Amino acid sequence: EELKNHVYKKTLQALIYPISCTTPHNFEVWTATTPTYCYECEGLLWGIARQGMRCTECGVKCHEKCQDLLNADCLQRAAEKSSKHGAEDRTQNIIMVLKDRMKIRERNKPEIFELIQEVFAVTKSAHTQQMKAVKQSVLDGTSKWSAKISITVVCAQGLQAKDKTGSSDPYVTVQVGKTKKRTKTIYGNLNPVWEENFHFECHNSSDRIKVRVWDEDDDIKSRVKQRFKRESDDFLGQTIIEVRTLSGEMDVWYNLDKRTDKSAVSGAIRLHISVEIKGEEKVAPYHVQYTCLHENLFHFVTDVQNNGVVKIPDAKGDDAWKVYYDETAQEIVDEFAMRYGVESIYQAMTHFACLSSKYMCPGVPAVMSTLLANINAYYAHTTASTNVSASDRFAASNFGKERFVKLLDQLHNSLRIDLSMYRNNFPASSPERLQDLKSTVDLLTSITFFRMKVQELQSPPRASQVVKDCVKACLNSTYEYIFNNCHELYGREYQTDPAKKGEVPPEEQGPSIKNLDFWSKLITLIVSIIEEDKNSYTPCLNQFPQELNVGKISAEVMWSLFAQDMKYAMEEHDKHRLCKSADYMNLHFKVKWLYNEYVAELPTFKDRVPEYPAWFEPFVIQWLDENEEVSRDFLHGALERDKKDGFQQTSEHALFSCSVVDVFSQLNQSFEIIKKLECPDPQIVGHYMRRFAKTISNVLLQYADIVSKDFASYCSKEKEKVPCILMNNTQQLRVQLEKMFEAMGGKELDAEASGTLKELQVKLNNVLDELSHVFATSFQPHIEECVRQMGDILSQVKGTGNVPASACSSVAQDADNVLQPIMDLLDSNLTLFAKICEKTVLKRVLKELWKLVMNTMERTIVLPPEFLSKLKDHMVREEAKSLTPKQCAVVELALDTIKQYFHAGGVGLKKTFLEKSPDLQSLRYALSLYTQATDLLIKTFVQTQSAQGSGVEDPVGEVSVHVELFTHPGTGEQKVTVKVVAANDLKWQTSGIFRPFIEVNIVGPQLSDKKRKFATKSKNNSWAPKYNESFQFSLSADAGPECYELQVCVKDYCFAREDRTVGLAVLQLRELAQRGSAACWLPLGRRIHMDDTGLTVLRILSQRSNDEVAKEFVKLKSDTRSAEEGGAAPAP
């Protein structure tokens, strides 16, 4: 209150006579060339020694030291000069100028005085009466030196003695003008203290105070003296003082002087002296008075006039920072800051303190950015010519540095706060609040700059980081709020059903387990925000463009917070599977899109393989599962529809049936659903491919199986189209599987998906072999039948250099006759199969058939039932009427015809495979036996009949031979010394005298020229007869001993009658080749055992029925004991 009313009064006084009424003294230096007296002090001006100043405008003559002590303006001092030259009336005139100035001022600017009244809340009547007071303080006070004076006589020291006591009873009189007063008396003292005050009136600075000290005589002498002298109280001394030496308040001691005829004087008097030319010395330092004025005015303007709205001033330039108000108010504070000097920066800091209480009002952040840029520029640069620091010049602020620092920090914090929710506090929908926002960051740069420049702080908070925190803050508050309120937000902001805009359950404003829609909704929220940040805020907040892309900070913050939440969601869905596979696939495309839009290009995530595919992968696998099972049900349907269609070929040249196509179509539709994800994690891809390669393997083996199963039922000799088509299906699987494997990225494929499909292809191959076999096999009975007929037809042909012209019928006619049963079957079927089998299929079929055929002929014709089943039977010791040249031909031509048929010009089998067919080469080889030489055949017999020695069926006795294989010392041939030691167990109890002897024979090749037989002497009546007789066979030199065997035979001697065979044993000379010599018991058989090659050779040697070696061989091997004299039957 005190300061407010003091400042009200001083503002009224300051502006009733505004200092802008005043005029300046144009002084010339002027020589007082005669003794002259100064119009201020009345002091001597004289010569050059004491020159004066003569004004022209005020005219006024004074000391130099007085030309400024001439206090009043050049109007008033022109008046006072005019009174001191002669015209006093000019003084009353300029008193009337002072009146008229104040009347005009009031009448012309009444709004100044009214505003001071309203700002200081004074009434109009009381304002009129305080205005009477400040009018009077310049209008009674228009020209006054009407001093009240208040003289405290304090004390004296060293006074003269005069007393009745012998000391003195000093009192004092004081006089000013005619008026006279006294102290009471100090008694008996020469150093008295009174401290006694006298008020006086003076009307002239050239008056004197008179002060006089008196010894108080109250005695008969003083009662007498009172009749003759005025001063009845013996005078102790005086001082006399000019009123112009006085001012304000004083406390001074003065030495004392004489006056009266009674005077004896010494010492001094102390006087306190007040002089009430003194006025408002009670100044709050005019700073503070101006502040009070300014705060009152500011609240009055903003709050009272403008209802708290900050009216931005009637301001001019950047120096709006110095024009705080409209004219009236501006002139108020300026006439105050002029009359009372208050510096422009102090005025400004006061205004910035005011504004900070309102900083949120529109445009105020631009004004405060301005005002602070200036208060900064002031302390940082204005008078930075002073070597004092900005922070210290700012300390020397009469406002108080600290008060200002606090104020900035509070404000800055309040800005940081508002920025931390920039979106909510400065919505993009208000460009005005986007501009206040922009001007706020301009203010915050201006504060950071003040801290850096005026406070001289070295690392103040960097304006970009300060704001980046606030943005991150505002973004995280956004994210929390969206993740918790997704439905309310997506609801109101976009939702594709108006019934879904409201407070949907929290399990749907955060994550649902039932649906993916919260997440599609959250995706759109995220997009929208990043857009607003990119689009409204990144431009609004461009001050740190390099540091502060609001759109990027948005995309990063929001995705990060999202991706966490989404990952857990996908894991949660995976436990429950309430949404369909498909829904997660749709969500995957949305998420794939979203990342690949906003996120992938932020450096942080450009740096990485996207992790999101790991979220969807189980749902893709689920889909692959649903897919495989559907595909396997489909597979069975397709196979069964095709089966119902009897497995027709898709066309007569599209050799597989339609199910193959359907399946590959399905598998491709399926694969493409996978492929359409393009998962950027190739191991998750690898997993899908492993999963699917299994699907494929399973489906295709299940096909190949369902085929392989039905296959044999179709192999019957009339549905033949169908097994062809099924093998073509199988092969077509392999073929399209190679394609699909390539489509899955071929050799680039996951090694285990690849492992699977390689395994699969190998199994499908092995299936196709077994089908080709099973197929070729169903014709086998027909083949065997036909081949037996061809064998029957061939048996009419014989060795036709030895037969008539119906069987010496040409090699061709015989071959044709022979061939005919098969050529019928062949031509039809191979043509049909060549038309309707895929070449892979056909080749396998044909190999199987070829083998089968070859083997069938080799058996059924070349080692035929029409030969050996006679010779080794009770039937004919066959020739097959000689398998000469002719039936070697016929067959070789038929084989060739067949080989051309199976070859089918390369449409069938390769002439290489056929020529190098073991089936053929064996067949050819058996054909070669038939034409061979007798000794080669006999050699083949002894070498193959190795078993002729190990085991005899029912022995008739045994022979002890000691045999020596001398590689002969006389010739280098092989000779065989057979020492016939004895026989034993001879089953020969004959009716005549028994006379046993032992024959020994040799068997092997090249024995036509050599003694094949020896015999011992006889022994009478003896069934274990000894001989000790030595024979010497010769072998060939060229054939080794393993080409030979002894054939021992005991016999009964009957001269003039006939000798009789008692038994037979074979000793292989292959043993004696090793043993060198051998004592051995040879069990005598009744016959000698053979194998099929003994018998094939014996069938070919029996054809040599005229060759004496072949006769004697066929005879000596068909040689047997008569059962007489010794019991049971032989065995084969």
Side-chain angles (χ1 to χ4, degrees), residues 56 259 276 305 645 814 853 927 944 986 1058 1116 1119:
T56 58
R259 191 182 194 208
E276 295 77 68
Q305 303 172 352
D645 195 34
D814 286 356
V853 165
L927 288 162
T944 55
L986 294 181
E1058 41 74 61
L1116 186 55
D1119 194 5

Side-chain angles (χ1 to χ4, degrees), residues 1088-1128:
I1088 299 165
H1089 316 301
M1090 296 197 207
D1091 69 38
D1092 69 356
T1093 305
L1095 296 167
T1096 297
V1097 166
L1098 198 85
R1099 112 176 102 185
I1100 296 164
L1101 292 179
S1102 68
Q1103 291 165 74
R1104 294 142 183 62
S1105 2
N1106 302 321
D1107 172 331
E1108 297 304 329
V1109 191
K1111 281 171 167 188
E1112 173 49 14
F1113 188 85
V1114 173
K1115 181 59 277 187
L1116 186 55
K1117 291 303 181 182
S1118 310
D1119 194 5
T1120 61
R1121 188 219 154 129
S1122 57
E1124 123 280 353
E1125 327 300 17

Side-chain angles (χ1 to χ4, degrees), residues 8-9 12 122 125-135:
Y8 172 65
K9 293 170 166 169
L12 292 181
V122 188
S125 56
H127 173 63
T128 303
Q129 307 328 113
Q130 181 55 39
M131 183 47 63
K132 163 73 72 177
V134 304
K135 277 171 181 174

Side-chain angles (χ1 to χ4, degrees), residues 139 232 404 525 1003:
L139 294 183
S232 55
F404 204 75
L525 288 164
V1003 183

Side-chain angles (χ1 to χ4, degrees), residues 814-835:
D814 286 356
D816 292 337
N817 299 340
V818 166
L819 275 165
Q820 208 57 59
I822 212 74
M823 291 283 274
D824 306 345
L825 182 70
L826 281 173
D827 201 316
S828 176
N829 282 281
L830 274 73
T831 303
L832 174 65
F833 303 160
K835 177 209 154 190

Side-chain angles (χ1 to χ4, degrees), residues 454-685:
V454 177
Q455 297 184 235
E456 295 165 324
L457 292 157
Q458 307 72 24
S459 304
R462 174 57 215 297
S464 64
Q465 184 58 61
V466 165
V467 174
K468 176 186 148 193
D469 305 329
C470 293
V471 166
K472 281 255 170 167
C474 196
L475 286 168
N476 276 272
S477 302
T478 307
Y479 184 87
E480 166 283 303
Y481 196 79
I482 80 171
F483 188 66
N484 294 331
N485 307 274
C486 170
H487 227 90
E488 164 260 280
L489 293 160
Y490 183 91
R492 185 173 59 271
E493 193 182 336
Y494 337 86
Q495 179 61 87
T496 63
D497 176 356
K500 295 183 185 180
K501 298 200 164 185
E503 299 294 4
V504 146
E507 333 83 78
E508 302 288 338
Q509 303 255 14
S512 190
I513 193 47
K514 320 301 172 178
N515 71 73
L516 309 184
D517 307 329
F518 165 86
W519 298 106
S520 295
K521 291 170 190 180
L522 197 71
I523 288 167
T524 311
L525 288 164
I526 289 168
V527 167
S528 177
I529 294 301
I530 300 162
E531 289 324 300
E532 191 188 57
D533 284 326
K534 188 160 49 175
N535 306 340
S536 304
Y537 290 106
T538 308
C540 178
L541 299 186
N542 63 286
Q543 289 82 347
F544 326 113
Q546 20 63 297
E547 292 173 272
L548 201 89
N549 183 332
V550 192
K552 277 195 167 181
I553 303 162
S554 188
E556 176 271 296
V557 172
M558 303 330 258
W559 151 262
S560 302
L561 296 165
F562 161 83
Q564 295 143 20
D565 297 343
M566 170 48 76
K567 180 160 192 168
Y568 92 64
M570 274 257 94
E571 291 173 349
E572 191 57 21
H573 284 294
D574 197 43
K575 303 164 196 177
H576 301 78
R577 297 288 193 71
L578 309 182
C579 328
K580 225 285 186 169
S581 52
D583 310 339
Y584 318 107
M585 325 308 273
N586 301 337
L587 186 69
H588 187 328
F589 302 127
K590 298 166 200 182
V591 169
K592 175 187 179 185
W593 161 70
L594 175 64
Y595 182 103
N596 300 1
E597 183 355 69
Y598 282 87
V599 187
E601 279 55 77
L602 306 170
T604 315
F605 312 114
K606 197 80 288 187
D607 291 341
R608 267 150 276 268
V609 176
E611 181 278 327
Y612 68 84
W615 309 347
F616 287 97
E617 169 179 43
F619 305 95
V620 180
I621 291 290
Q622 168 209 352
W623 179 78
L624 277 151
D625 305 334
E626 293 166 13
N627 171 257
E628 171 161 358
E629 300 349 301
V630 168
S631 303
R632 290 174 85 198
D633 305 336
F634 171 105
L635 158 74
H636 306 148
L639 278 161
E640 291 13 304
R641 285 178 282 269
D642 205 352
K643 191 159 181 175
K644 184 63 271 178
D645 195 34
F647 302 110
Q648 307 326 304
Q649 44 196 350
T650 303
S651 69
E652 298 307 293
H653 51 271
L655 307 188
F656 52 81
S657 72
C658 63
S659 53
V660 182
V661 191
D662 301 334
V663 167
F664 270 78
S665 178
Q666 186 44 254
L667 288 164
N668 284 286
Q669 298 154 42
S670 305
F671 173 34
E672 296 3 304
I673 294 151
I674 311 162
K675 195 54 267 185
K676 281 182 299 185
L677 296 155
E678 301 84 15
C679 163
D681 184 311
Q683 296 79 14
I684 289 181
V685 174

Side-chain angles (χ1 to χ4, degrees), residues 172-408:
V172 181
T173 61
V174 183
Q175 172 200 349
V176 189
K178 219 300 190 178
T179 305
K180 180 178 175 186
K181 300 183 177 185
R182 64 162 289 187
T183 75
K184 294 186 179 180
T185 303
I186 302 303
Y187 294 86
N189 198 345
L190 305 182
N191 308 299
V193 182
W194 300 275
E195 290 276 23
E196 287 187 56
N197 187 277
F198 309 101
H199 295 85
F200 289 96
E201 305 71 38
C202 176
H203 307 286
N204 169 36
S205 55
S206 298
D207 280 353
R208 293 84 237 293
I209 302 173
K210 302 97 175 186
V211 180
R212 306 196 181 104
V213 193
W214 315 99
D215 194 342
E216 189 162 64
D217 304 304
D218 282 306
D219 61 9
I220 296 172
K221 289 198 175 184
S222 76
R223 298 299 87 84
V224 170
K225 282 172 172 178
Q226 281 176 335
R227 307 162 204 185
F228 306 105
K229 288 296 194 182
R230 44 149 140 69
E231 298 141 297
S232 55
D233 294 81
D234 258 37
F235 171 78
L236 302 183
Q238 69 176 344
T239 186
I240 301 184
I241 304 161
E242 305 203 308
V243 170
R244 85 167 289 107
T245 65
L246 323 172
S247 58
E249 181 156 72
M250 308 164 67
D251 184 5
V252 176
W253 74 247
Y254 302 89
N255 287 286
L256 293 179
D257 308 330
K258 293 180 182 177
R259 191 182 194 208
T260 68
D261 308 307
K262 266 57 179 176
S263 304
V265 175
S266 60
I269 187 162
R270 187 181 165 192
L271 309 173
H272 150 288
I273 303 170
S274 187
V275 181
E276 295 77 68
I277 66 186
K278 190 194 173 81
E280 174 244 351
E281 318 316 325
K282 72 149 272 69
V283 328
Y286 252 102
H287 304 85
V288 170
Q289 288 201 61
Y290 174 101
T291 291
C292 161
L293 173 59
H294 195 114
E295 285 170 348
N296 280 295
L297 212 162
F298 159 76
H299 105 280
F300 195 86
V301 169
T302 54
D303 311 307
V304 186
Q305 303 172 352
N306 295 282
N307 317 300
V309 183
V310 188
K311 182 262 168 87
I312 297 167
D314 310 341
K316 306 87 176 174
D318 189 13
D319 300 293
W321 95 260
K322 305 204 182 101
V323 177
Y324 330 97
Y325 310 111
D326 307 28
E327 169 280 319
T328 307
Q330 186 63 32
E331 178 153 302
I332 282 156
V333 299
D334 293 342
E335 283 280 335
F336 210 90
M338 283 187 283
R339 187 179 271 276
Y340 322 118
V342 179
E343 66 277 14
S344 60
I345 185 60
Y346 182 96
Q347 307 174 33
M349 295 167 85
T350 302
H351 178 43
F352 186 89
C354 289
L355 287 186
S356 75
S357 69
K358 325 285 182 183
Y359 80 81
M360 315 72 53
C361 289
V364 180
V367 183
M368 290 193 77
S369 187
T370 299
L371 180 52
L372 184 56
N374 287 290
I375 287 162
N376 181 101
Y378 195 95
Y379 284 115
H381 325 309
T382 76
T383 77
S385 54
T386 69
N387 309 85
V388 182
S389 83
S391 192
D392 298 329
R393 179 172 34 266
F394 174 41
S397 184
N398 207 129
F399 179 99
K401 159 159 180 199
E402 6 54 43
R403 182 190 165 199
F404 204 75
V405 172
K406 295 165 197 180
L407 157 63
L408 289 165

